[PDB]
Design a protein around this ligand. Structure first.
Ligand SMILES: [Ca+2]
Ligand SMILES: [Ca+2]
Length: 149
């Protein structure tokens, strides 16, 4: 997979809420998918398998930037023992008018991942009520997204 920028993600499993808090903090040096040399980025998240197709979250769109700051956090209600059953799919897109939005890149976290994609997830799961915030380099190859380039 080729690099498409970096994303800073925060994860915290809250015992009180019985929920995974997912923070989309900011991105750095995203791929430019517009004719002006920039992108209009937003980030989507899913928690999969998504029983009932309700896990979609999307950040606001930031205009004309390759270094967006989102500082948004969402929550997935889930018992701690089910966390290891799931993958967190985080994808970055470029909002366009007049055509479908361009895919920028993504990252998938889960116990079946590798390297820091695995370690970030594992660190969250093994440290309840501790926020773990880590950068990941985006890939251009996300299953179910677009063809690799
Ligand atoms: Ca575009
Ligand atoms: Ca655009």
């Amino acid at each position: 997979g080729e690099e498409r920028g970096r994303i800073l993600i925060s994860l915290k499993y809250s015992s009180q809420k019985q929920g995974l808090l997912v923070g989309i903090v900011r991105c750095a040096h995203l791929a430019a998918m517009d004719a002006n040399g920039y992108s209009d980025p937003y980030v989507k998240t899913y928690l999969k398998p998504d029983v009932d197709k309700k896990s979609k979250h999307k950040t606001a769109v930031k205009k004309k930037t390759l270094n967006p700051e989102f500082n948004e956090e969402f929550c997935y209600e889930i018992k701690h023992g089910d966390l290891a059953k799931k993958t967190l799919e985080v994808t970055v897109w470029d909002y366009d008018i007049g055509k479908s939005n361009d895919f920028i890149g993504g990252v998938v976290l889960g116990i079946n991942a590798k390297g820091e994609r695995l370690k970030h997830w594992f660190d969250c799961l093994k440290n309840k009520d501790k926020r773990i915030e880590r950068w990941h380099t985006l890939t251009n190859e996300i299953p179910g997204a677009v063809l690799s380039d």
